[PDB]
Structure formats: C-alpha cells, structure tokens
Symmetry: C4
Subunit: 86 residues, 4 copies
C-alpha cells in the first residue's frame, strides 16, 4: 500500500499541475503542451522547449522536479527490495 500511495499523488501532480500552468505562463496556451512538459519534468529529461518564465510557474516546476527525482527512487526501491528478500 506504501508504493500505491506514492504513485497516485505523483500521477495526480502530472495531471493537476499542467492545468494552472497554461493560464499563468504566456508561452503555454493549451493543456497538451503543458502535459508534455509535465512528463518531461517528472522524468528529469528536460529538453528546454517549454520553460517557466514567471516565478509562480518556477515554484510549481520545482515541486514537479523534487517529486520527479523521488519517483525515480520509488521505482528503484520497488525492484531492489523485490530481489533482496529472496
């Protein structure tokens, strides 16, 4: 249940956070562009095609990155502890 609780809140961020981003950012004008940026930021790829200019968007992006690196550590723990037990 510990793994499911960590991914459900992560999936919600990658779905809920792209919604306000469209309105506050002058570069983003629709949800598909913000959703694509969300995946890119959450997977720590960062192409640089879409970048938050406003400080409000930069604070929101920092949360996505902090939860993005934590997601990598959560997936790693799901495989590492799976073979360590037996």
């Amino acid at each position: 249940n510990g793994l499911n609780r960590f991914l459900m809140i992560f999936v919600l961020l990658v779905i809920i956070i792209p919604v306000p981003m469209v309105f506050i950012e002058p570069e983003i004008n629709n949800y598909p562009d913000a959703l694509w940026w969300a995946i890119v930021t959450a997977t720590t790829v960062g192409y640089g095609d879409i970048v938050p200019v406003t400080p409000i968007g930069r604070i929101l992006a920092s949360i996505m990155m902090l939860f993005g690196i934590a997601f990598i550590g959560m997936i790693t723990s799901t495989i590492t502890n799976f073979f360590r037990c037996k």
Copy 2:
C-alpha cells in the same frame, strides 16, 4: 534471467520506436537522427535538439521516458543487490 528480460525489451524500444518517429515527425527525416534522440531520451539527458511536435510522437516519447527512468533503477538494483548478498 530477470535482469536480461528487462534490458532486452528496453534495447528493443531504442531500436524499434525510432523507425515510425521519422515518418510522423516533420523535424526528423532519417533513422540516424531518430536513433540519436532515442538514446538521449532513454538515458534521461534531453538536449532539446530533437523534440516531438506531433501528439502521436509525444505519446511514444513518454513510453521511452517511463522505460528510461526504469532502466536507471534496473542498473542500480544490479549493483546494490550484488554487494548486499555478502
């Protein structure tokens, strides 16, 4: 056998996925450009020189990223559990 099964399906993506990408994307016009992008997307480097514009290409890129971060966790588990035994 668990590690080999996870990497063979990963290598398959970085080989098969660059093929449709060339045709659907107007930016990519040849396989060497799409293959280079595939490694960059999988290793979670993301330079931003090659970016999927079409939504079809963006969905395909998301799979490459999800399997890309999972690959990092698979390589980490291969070293962490190796010394954990003894």
Copy 3:
C-alpha cells in the same frame, strides 16, 4: 543523523552558490534567475535556458552536478534501506 547531514550541506549549496553566480555571469542579472538554475542543475533536469559561459561559473556548476547526482543516490538509499530492514 547521517541523512540530515548530507541534505543540509546540499540545500546550503542550492542557496549559497546562486549568489556569486549573478555577478560573475553576464547572462544572470538577479538572484531569482540563479536560484531557478540551481534547482534545475541539482535535480539533473537541465533545460538550457540559463548556462554558465565563464570558466569560473562552469567549475561552480560542476560541483552542483556532482552533489546533484549524489542527492538522487541519497534519496534512493532512504527508501531502499527503509523496507530492507523488515
């Protein structure tokens, strides 16, 4: 106490290092721009919107990256060893 000591020195960098960066770099002209770059460099996202041109800034950025990848490994160890105990 081992985890707290590793993150307090990390957070210190993402707070202290953006200060000299503003003065030595001609691209950066204020702290909010350098602070945003610091989080992006530490989380290993790297958009490329802000880049160190001077060699002094490039040496400082390398420390942020080395401590950035070490931070990913520290968060992973905090979850992997948590369930490994029992």
Copy 4:
C-alpha cells in the same frame, strides 16, 4: 577495490573523450568547451548548448551517457550498502 576501478575508468572518459571531440566537431573549437560538455553528459543534466552533430561524435556521446547513468548507480550503491550491513 571494486568501487575505485569503476570511478578511475569513468574519470578517464570525462578527461580523454573531450580531446578527439574538439577536432571532429565543427561546433567545439577548444578543450574547455568539450570538458564542460563531458561533465554535463556524465551527470545526465544535458543543457543542449553543446550537441554532437557528426555521427562519430554521437557514438562517443552514447558511451558517455551509458557510463553516466552507471556512475549514478555506482554512487547510490556506495551509500545504500554502507548502511544495509549495520
């Protein structure tokens, strides 16, 4: 001795690989620019300021990325197995 052998070959790549890169790439014209790119590629940051255009440089960059993600897994294993034993 296992950890030292993995980092000495990695440090060598980030020092030796930037040397041929300067000559084969028309974008790179000196060692400090190629050395900066090497750190960026090895730490999986990828700003996109410096990108390999030639296929020769793209093959060399792929090795740096494969050894770059493996370096993250090596540093993680050095901390995870340090607390797991006791």
